[PDB]
């Protein structure tokens, strides 16, 4: 009880310490948990032969960026 | 800076209201003050849980809105708009 009240809640802590702890907590709780899906679109874009006949290569079929 | 300052002020207000409500019984007192007795890292970890609609954290809506707006602005700046 008193051994738990003796340690200060973060309102007694200096603001810089609480800011650092909030930065870590924000990171793990929000930035790490943030999820966006891009893999299918990225692979589809990387597998496209980009205007290879349009630009004058005059050579063999050059491999795509994914290849 | 200002987010943590407002958070600390509101935690002081909540702690005062918790201290001034100890007449009926002390059974609810322990679960009320578990937040203030938790380690400082765990306090922020459980108090930043207002993402999604779980809303177990005691953070009030006006403070929640500030972080929710700043996070959207940060995602827009990062290009995940």
UniProtKB/Swiss-Prot annotation, chain A:
Pathological condition linked to this protein in its record: Ventricular tachycardia, catecholaminergic polymorphic, 1, with or without atrial dysfunction and/or dilated cardiomyopathy: An arrhythmogenic disorder characterized by stress-induced, bidirectional ventricular tachycardia that may degenerate into cardiac arrest and cause sudden death. Patients present with recurrent syncope, seizures, or sudden death after physical activity or emotional stress. CPVT1 inheritance is autosomal dominant.
Location(s), subcellular: Sarcoplasmic reticulum membrane
Tissues in which the UniProt entry reports expression: Detected in heart muscle (at protein level). Heart muscle, brain (cerebellum and hippocampus) and placenta.
Post-translational note: Channel activity is modulated by phosphorylation. Phosphorylation is increased in failing heart, leading to calcium leaks and increased cytoplasmic Ca(2+) levels.
Subunit structure: Homotetramer. Can also form heterotetramers with RYR1 and RYR3. Interacts with FKBP1A and FKBP1B; these interactions may stabilize the channel in its closed state and prevent Ca(2+) leaks. Interacts with CALM and S100A1; these interactions regulate channel activity. Identified in a complex composed of RYR2, FKBP1B, PKA catalytic subunit, PRKAR2A, AKAP6, and the protein phosphatases PP2A and PP1. Interacts directly with FKBP1B, PKA, PP1 and PP2A. Interacts with SELENON. In cardiac muscles, identified in a complex, composed of FSD2, CMYA5 and RYR2.
Full protein name: Ryanodine receptor 2
Role noted for this protein: Cytosolic calcium-activated calcium channel that mediates the release of Ca(2+) from the sarcoplasmic reticulum into the cytosol and thereby plays a key role in triggering cardiac muscle contraction. Aberrant channel activation can lead to cardiac arrhythmia. In cardiac myocytes, calcium release is triggered by increased Ca(2+) cytosolic levels due to activation of the L-type calcium channel CACNA1C. The calcium channel activity is modulated by formation of heterotetramers with RYR3. Required for cellular calcium ion homeostasis. Required for embryonic heart development.
Domain comment quoted from the record: The calcium release channel activity resides in the C-terminal region while the remaining part of the protein resides in the cytoplasm.
Species name: Homo sapiens (Human)
Induction of its expression: By TGFB1.
Family indicated by similarity: Belongs to the ryanodine receptor (TC 1.A.3.1) family. RYR2 subfamily.
Gene for this chain: RYR2
């Amino acid at each position: 009880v008193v051994a738990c009240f003796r340690m200060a809640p973060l309102y007694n802590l200096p603001r810089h310490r609480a800011v650092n702890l909030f930065l870590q907590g924000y990171e793990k709780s929000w930035i790490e948990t943030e999820e966006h899906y891009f893999e299918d679109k990225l692979i589809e874009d990387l597998a496209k032969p980009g205007a290879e006949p349009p630009e004058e290569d005059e050579g063999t079929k050059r491999v795509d960026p994914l290849h | 800076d200002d987010f943590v300052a407002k958070l600390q002020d509101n935690q002081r207000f909540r702690y005062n209201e918790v201290m001034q409500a100890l007449n009926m019984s002390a059974a609810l007192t322990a679960r009320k003050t578990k937040e203030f007795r938790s380690p400082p890292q765990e306090q922020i970890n459980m108090l930043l849980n207002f993402k999604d609609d779980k809303s177990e954290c005691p953070c009030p809506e006006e403070i929640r809105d500030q972080l929710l707006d700043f996070h959207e602005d940060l995602m827009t700046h990062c290009g995940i708009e």
